[model samples]
Target: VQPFAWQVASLADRYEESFDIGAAVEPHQLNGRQGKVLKHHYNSIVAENAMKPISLQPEEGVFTWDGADAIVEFARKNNMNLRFHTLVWHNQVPDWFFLDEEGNPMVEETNEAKRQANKELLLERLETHIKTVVERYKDDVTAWDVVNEVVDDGTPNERGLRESVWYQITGDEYIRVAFETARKYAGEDAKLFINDYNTEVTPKRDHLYNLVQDLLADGVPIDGVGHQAHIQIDWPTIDEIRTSMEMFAGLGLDNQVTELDVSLYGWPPRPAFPTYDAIPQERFQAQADRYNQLFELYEELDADLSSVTFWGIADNHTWLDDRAREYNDGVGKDAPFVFDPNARVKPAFWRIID
Candidate 1:
C-alpha cells in the first residue's frame, strides 16, 4: 500500500524506525525509496509564508511570487502532485486590506464609507491573490482547497469562539469569491475544494451540506468538499466524521480529508498554542486511534476522496504548537505530530500505517 505522511524535511531520518511511512510533499522536498511512504504535495503553504499582511504591498500591484515560486520548484524536483491549501479565508490577512483610507483597520467602524471601502479593498485583494496564485500553479498543482474554514458548526463563534473578519465584512461571500476565483483560474482539469473542520456529524455536516447546496446553485465553481477532520476526542465522534463524509459524498462531489489533526485536551486559547506537556500519553494514543478510525471511514466512504493531509511534520514547527504549546517545557506546546522533534517515529506514526 502507498503509505501517507505530511511535510517533514528528514523523512529519510524517520524511516529508520518505522516501515509504514509517507511524506507530506511540499514544493521543496522530494520523496525517496530511502523513505518507506510515498508522497502527496499539498498547497496553500506557498502563498501562506506572509505571516503578516504587509508582505503583500501596493494592494493592486502584482503580488510578489517568491513564497509560492519556491514551492513550485521544490515540488517539481520531488516529482510530487500539488494540493493547494486555500485561496480564501479570514485569518492571516494583511492589515491594509482591512484599513480605511487613513490606513487603520475598521474594527470599530459604524459608518458606511468605512465599511464600503473596507469591503472593496478586501474583495480586490481576494480577487488578485486567488486568481494569481491558482493560475500560476494551475499546471502543476492537481487539487485545491479553494476555500478554507468558512463555517461554524458547534459554536456560532468557532475556533476560540468568535466570528473572524470574514464573517464581519463579507459574511459568507468569502467562500463564494474563493471558489469563483479558483474556478476562473484553475480551469477544468484542476480540482477545487471547499474545506472546513469538525464537520463530521449532525449540525456541522448539515451546515456544510446546506451551504454547499447554496454554493452549487449560486454557480460557485466548486468541485469537491474537504472534511478537515481537525477532530477532538469526544466532541466530534468517529461516527460524526463518517456522517459528514457520506453526507458530502451524496452531493456528487469528490471528498477529501484535509488538515487532519485530532486534539486531546481542550483547544487552547489563541496567542497561546497547545503545549507538549499539555498532551498526555493517553491523548497521543487517542490521536493514533483517530487516524485508524479515519482510515476505516476512508474505506467505508468508497468515495473518490482525493487526499488526506496532516497539518504539519514535527511538533516543533507546527503552528498549533507555536501558537498553542512547545518542544521543551517553557520552550513551547507538546507536539501533535506523528514524529518527534529529532524525527523519531511516535505511536501516531504506527497507528496510521497499521
Candidate 2:
C-alpha cells in the first residue's frame, strides 16, 4: 500500500539489510495530518533546519535549544530513531566564526601570527560547538552529518574541499577538527557523515570519494557518507548513484541517502506545473517509475546502504515548493514527494511498493 510496506530489509542474501526509512521534518510540520502520515510510515526523523548551526546558535554562546528540543521530545514519544542533521557546514554558520580576536571580520592576513590566531580561534569554537550541540542528544541521536558539503566545487585542489569561511580560516584542518571533535564528543557509537549534493555527478563523485578516502586514510573517524540525494524524476542514471555508493562501500563506510527526494523536474529544471493537478499524468508515472528503479538498486545494494531518507514528508511542505518558481514566478507548485499535499500516497508510493 505504501513505500515502506514492501519491507525489503527481510530480503534474502543481503548483508543484514534493514533501512531506517526516514523523513526530514520541522516542528511546524510535526502536528498536522502530515505528521500523522509521517509517524505511520517513517521510523526515523531529522530536523529539516532546526538543528542547523544558525538555528541552534544564531549568536555566539547563545544556544537556542527550544527549536531542536521540540523535535527531540517528539521523537522520544514516538519511539523514533534520530539523525542530528549537521554540526559543521559551509552555510548557515554565524559570522562570529569568521571574526578575529578583536571582533573584526576575518581577512586573508598577510601576517602569519594573525592567521595562526584565527585558525586556533575557529577550531576552538568548532570544538566547543560540536561538544555542546552533540553531547546533549547523543543518547537520542546516533548519527550526525558531521561536515556538510565540504567537498570542493571541482576546481583543482589538494583535498577537494569547499572554500567556505571555515576552509578560508582553517583550510582542511577545519575538516579534520570538525570530525575529530564530533567523534570525541558525539560518543563512540555515533555515525559521523560528510554530506553533500550532486555526488552522483562524476566531478563531485570523484572529488568526494578522493576526499573521503584521504580523510579515512589519516584515520578521521568518518563512519559514513551522506548522499543528499536531492535527485529529480529524470536524468542522473540510477547506475551513477550505484557506482558512487559502490565506491564508498569499497572504503567500508556506511552509505546513507540522507535527503532523498525525487523532484518532478530533472536537470534542466521543469517549469512549475501551473498547479499540482496540472502536473501531467505522465509525469506522475515517470516519477513513480523513478522511485521504482532507485529502490530496486537500493535493495540490491542494501548491504552497504545504512538507510534511505526522503527530504520531505509531503508535497505541501516540501522545500522544493518555492525552489522551482524562484527564477520564474507566477503560480507554480513543485510536487516532489511520494505523498501529495493531502498526505495521501501518490503513484510514486504504489510504484515503489509494487
Candidate 3:
C-alpha cells in the first residue's frame, strides 16, 4: 500500500450536502498548504478573523473590504457555503462603537441622561454596522453568528449576560437590537446564531440556555445557537456536549458546532508550556480518539447539529497556538488540529474521517 494516508478523504464528501463540514480561515490562508486542505476537505467556510468587526470596520464608518471580500470571493469561486463568523462581538470591535457623540468612552453611566444617550448612540451604531455588513453578504452567507459569547459564566442567579461593554452600557438591549437588525437584513434563509464557548459546562450551558430562552421568549429573532466546541483532549466528556445539544434542540433552533478545536491540554494551569520537540505519539492518539468520540455523538444529532467547523485547517497557525502563554503565562505550542504543522494528517484526521 503506497501510504493511503497521503491521500485523505473529503470531509465534505464524508458527510452529505445538507450537513456542512467546514473550517475557519482567512484570505492569506487560502494560498498554501492550509489552502489545499481547505479546498479539498471542507465544503463550508468562515473567516477566522478577517470578517470580524474590527477587521471590516477598523475606525468607524470607514469600511475595509479587501480581506473579507477575498474570503467571500474564494467561497463563491469554490462553491462553498460561507458561514459568517460574527457581526456583534464584545471583542474585535472598534472603540467608537462604545463611545458617545462627545467621543467619551461609553463606560459606567455618569448620569441618567448620559446613560440614555449612550444606549441610543450605541444601538444606532449597531444597527448601521449590522445593516452595512449583513446586507452586503446577506445572500452570500448562510448563517451569521450575529452575537458571539454574550452569555456569562457564574451562579445561575447572577444576571445571565456577560459584562461586555455592549451589556454594560446597553444591558441585554444590545442582544435584542443585534438579532433584530440582523434578521431585518439577512437573507430570508440565513440563520442568526448566538455563539459562545464553555457551553458544555453545566453552569455556563444552563446560563446560556436561560439567555436564549429569554431571547426567544421576547421574539429576539434568533434562529440558532452556536456551541464553540473549543474542547481539550479530556475536559468535556461527550455526554456533557450531548446534553447541551439536547437542551438547545428543544428550542426548535439550529445547533451548530462553531470554532471546534480539540486542544492537547486539559482544563487549565498547564505546566508552563513544555518544550516538546514533537508531541509524543500517545498524546496524538488520545486526541484522535477524543475527536472520534465527538464525531460519533454529532452523527446521532445530525438532524439538529447542522454543521461542525474546525477552528483552523492545520496545527501550524491557530488561535490556540500561543493562547497558553498569552493568557496562562505558560509557554507551549498547541497542536489542536487534524493536520500537523507541515499540513500532514495526524491520527486525528483519520479517526475523524473513519
Per-candidate TM equals 0.73, 0.93, 0.94
- Candidate 2 segments exceeding 4 Å error: 1-17, 156-158
Following a full C-alpha superposition, what root-mean-square deviation does model 2 have from the true structure?
3.2
Point out the higher-scoring one by TM-score: 2 or 3: 3
What tens digits encode model 1's per-residue C-alpha lDDT throughout 1-354?
Answer: 213344333332332232112224332333342122333322222323431133434354646666556656655765555566656556655555666667777666789876877777777777877776666678887678777777665657432222678668866776778777777777876778877776766566676788888878888777788766666556576676666767777777888766655554455523333445555677678777766676666655654565655665555445555534343343446455666655456676676544
Location of the lowest summed lDDT over 10 successive residues in candidate 1: 14-23
Candidates in descending lDDT order: 3, 2, 1
lDDT (C-alpha, whole model) for all candidates: 0.59, 0.81, 0.83
RMSD of each: 6.4, 3.2, 2.1
Residues 205-316, candidate 3: write the lDDT tens digits: 8888888888898978888899899999887888899999989999898899999998888656364255444568888899899989988899889988988898888777
Q: Which of the two, 1 or 3, has more lDDT? A: 3
Q: Model 1, 161: alpha-carbon shift in Å? A: 13
Error of 2 at 50 (Å): 0.4
Tens-place lDDT per residue, model 2, 1-354, is 333422332111122345778889888877756666766677788999999989998888998998899999988998888888888887788888778878887775668888898889889988989989987898899678988998876765666668878877788898889889988877788888889898899787888988888888899999999999988876678889989999999999899999988888855455678678788979888889998898888888888887777888878777776677773474567877777776667788766655
Predicted model with the maximum TM-score: 3
